[PDB]
């Protein structure tokens, strides 16, 4: 295969395609509570339109892994990533914004596609 496809929930709700392999070893995978730094771009599957590319180039996005800060599919995806990994992740609505959707562009029952690059992570004191 060109790329490794990784099913991250058994229900098919979160599926990752590894575009660029990251660094081998457990020490290179972020742990719960760590600050992680990424680039990303998000696209809505239904319309095919990119809704967020603000963090896709020079500006990094930071969040705390597995701390209720982001949609579940992001915690599930990033917890599987190796430092320097670039992936495509397809997130069904159960692991995204569910029925509520988000903002003007993302309705209920949306499938989201993100490209995510894991740049770095750190443990908090
Ligand atoms: C301008 O751009 C927005 C991000 C946009 C919003 C709209 C969506 C389409 C999107 O375009 O991102 C997008 O691409 C997206 O879907 N994202 C952002 C990238 C991570 C994955 C996902 C997400 O979960 O967004 C998140 C989603 C929209 C809302 C959360 C979903 C999970 C749920 O459990 C949370 O309940 C609380 C709410 C937004 C975030 O990643 C930001 C960082 C986090 C929060 C706002 C909350 O965690 C909040 O809870 C108190 C916090 O603790 C924060 C740190 C407090 C500080 C002051 C607020 C910072 C706000 C920053 C906002 C930013 C950069």
Curated annotation (Swiss-Prot):
Belongs to the FKBP-type PPIase family. It is found in: Cytoplasm; Nucleus. It comes from Plasmodium falciparum (isolate 3D7). This is Peptidyl-prolyl cis-trans isomerase FKBP35. Signal peptide: none annotated. Residues 33-122 form the PPIase FKBP-type domain. The gene is FKBP35. Has peptidylprolyl isomerase (PPIase) and co-chaperone activities. Assists protein folding by catalyzing the peptidyl conversion of cis and trans rotamers of the prolyl amide bond of protein substrates. Inhibits calcineurin phosphatase activity in vitro. Plays an essential role in merozoite egress from host erythrocytes. Homodimer. Interacts (via TPR repeats) with HSP90 (probably via MEEVD motif). The PPIase FKBP-type domain contributes to the chaperone activity. Required for the inhibition of calcineurin phosphatase activity. It comes from the Eukaryota.
């Amino acid at each position: 295969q060109e790329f490794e496809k990784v099913e991250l929930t058994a229900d098919g709700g979160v599926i990752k395609t590894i575009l660029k392999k990251g660094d081998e070893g457990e020490e290179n995978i972020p742990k719960k509570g760590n600050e992680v730094t990424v680039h990303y771009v998000g696209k809505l599957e239904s319309t095919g339109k990119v809704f967020d590319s603000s963090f896709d180039r020079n500006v990094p996005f930071k969040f705390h892994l597995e701390q209720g800060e982001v949609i579940k599919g992001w915690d599930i995806c990033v917890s599987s990533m190796r430092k320097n990994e670039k992936c495509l992740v397809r997130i069904e609505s159960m692991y995204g914004y569910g029925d509520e959707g988000c903002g003007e562009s993302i309705p209920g029952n949306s499938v989201l596609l993100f490209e995510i690059e894991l740049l770095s992570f750190r443990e908090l004191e």
